[PDB]
Design a binder for these strands. Structure first.
Length: 437
RNA sequence: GGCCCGGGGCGGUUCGAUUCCGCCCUGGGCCAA
């Protein structure tokens, strides 16, 4: 149980055993041939080509090089044609552009079309850059593949490995650049402990400096940030995670944390114990991809949080869960019920013009003076958080994201109490309240 | 689809709004795939 002792056993969870590496080779072999018999210009990229794939995430990425002069349209049509005749099973996926996804000899395969180019400039879509990235990486990551694997396992185990919007963590390309830079997993970890929210890592210049944000400059483009979508808190959890590992290394850092489910009865008690208001917003899940969905959930949650805090309900944290069935926006406030009356700041006493207007407004309670200015008692339209969120949600649906909002407008309900405990959100709430044990 | 910056119009709220809550047009930048 010192770092070395532990990393020895970690390799055993991140590195693909012989039957997984093999099964991959036979795929590539066969996948190679099919392409050759159709005489197609391709190039394997991604972690498979660079043997940097994590044990159990075997996925081959085949990019088809196309003449610079071809139209995007030709690229997809011929790409669709090629992916089609070369895949046991084929399925049309989408991202910046449409591409084919399939399976060969039992393994995942992506068949992406892109332009054959030289010089990063003239890249028309992120996918054009992929070839350069791989080109810049192949010679430099050689002999450190397992260091990359250890770093991917770590991030994966602590729920921050992907860069898609559902994670906002460290992309795979970010992982290898880090190794190229620090030489190994441990060095990366040891140095990360001194990372701040202002750290900039210029792989190309082999330098580390201070910027205006966490920035890992792409060796292939000096203006692009590889860790651009790494959220601030996710960067925080990592720095802290390295700090801990280094203080007491454990094989537990590479093992996914167990769900740790709680009986609802217990959950209720804690909420009773916390004395806070806990409720969730339930609406149907828009039939869209996670990359559009999650950023919307974040928006919705945020807009409602801010409605709650400006409306003096003292919210503590927000959260959200997504299912096949519905989406849950969760909340916790310090105020279960506020008074109807509240005070409104009026003009200063010596402004006759405004004082008069401020008084022309007939009110139920008759304003008063305090510290040189007039004030007024006013009544609220709602006195509980839920009551407030039913109002805000019913009228502000349009500001909660294009999709999420359109779904909320057509349906939603506010759940709380026991009826809430039983919904598919128990885990999220435990994280939102730091329930421990 | 989401985030950043900027223009032109509006609505509501307020003694008072460029300034708070929001809506329509609209220019550029960026992110995930």
């Amino acid at each position: 149980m010192k770092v070395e002792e532990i990393l020895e056993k970690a390799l055993e969870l991140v590195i693909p055993d012989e039957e997984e590496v093999r099964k991959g080779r036979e795929a590539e072999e066969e996948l190679r041939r099919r392409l050759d018999e159709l005489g197609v210009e391709y190039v394997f990229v991604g972690s498979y080509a660079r043997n940097t794939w994590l044990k159990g995430s075997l996925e081959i990425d085949v990019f088809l090089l196309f003449p610079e002069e071809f139209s995007k349209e030709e690229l997809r049509e011929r790409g669709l044609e090629i992916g089609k005749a070369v895949l046991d099973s084929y399925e049309i996926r989408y991202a910046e552009h449409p591409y084919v996804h399939g399976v060969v000899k039992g393994v995942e395969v992506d068949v992406v079309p892109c332009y054959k180019l030289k010089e990063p400039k003239n890249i028309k879509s992120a996918v054009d850059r992929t070839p350069f990235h791989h080109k810049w990486l192949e010679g430099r990551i050689k002999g450190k593949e397992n260091e990359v694997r250890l770093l991917k396992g770590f991030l994966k185990a602590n729920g921050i490995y992907g860069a898609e919007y559902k994670v906002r963590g460290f992309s795979g390309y970010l992982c290898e650049l880090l190794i190229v830079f620090y030489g190994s997993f441990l060095e990366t970890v040891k140095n990360a402990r001194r990372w701040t929210r202002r750290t900039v890592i210029d792989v190309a210049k082999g330098e580390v400096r201070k910027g205006e944000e966490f920035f890992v400059v792409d060796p292939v483009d000096e203006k692009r940030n590889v860790a651009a979508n790494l959220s601030l808190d996710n960067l925080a959890r990592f720095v802290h995670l390295c700090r801990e590992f280094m203080e007491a290394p454990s094989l537990g850092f590479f093992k996914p944390k167990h769900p740790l489910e709680i009986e609802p009865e217990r959950l209720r008690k804690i909420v009773e114990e916390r004395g806070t208001a806990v409720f969730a917003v339930k609406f149907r899940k828009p039939d869209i991809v996670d990359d559009n969905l999650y950023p919307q959930l974040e928006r919705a949650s945020r807009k409602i949080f801010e409605f709650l805090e400006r409306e003096n309900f003292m919210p503590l944290r927000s959260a959200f869960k997504a299912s096949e069935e519905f989406c849950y926006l969760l909340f916790e406030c310090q105020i279960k019920e506020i008074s109807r009356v509240f005070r409104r700041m009026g003009p200063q006493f010596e402004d006759e013009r405004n004082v008069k207007k401020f008084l022309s407004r007939n009110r139920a309670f008759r304003p008063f003076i305090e510290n040189g200015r007039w004030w007024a008692f006013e009544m609220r339209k709602f006195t509980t958080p839920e009551e407030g969120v039913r109002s805000y949600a019913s009228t502000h649906w349009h500001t909660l994201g294009k999709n999420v909002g359109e779904s909320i407008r057509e349906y939603f309900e506010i759940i709380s109490g026991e009826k809430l405990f039983k919904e598919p959100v128990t885990a999220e709430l435990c994280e939102m309240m730091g329930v421990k044990d």
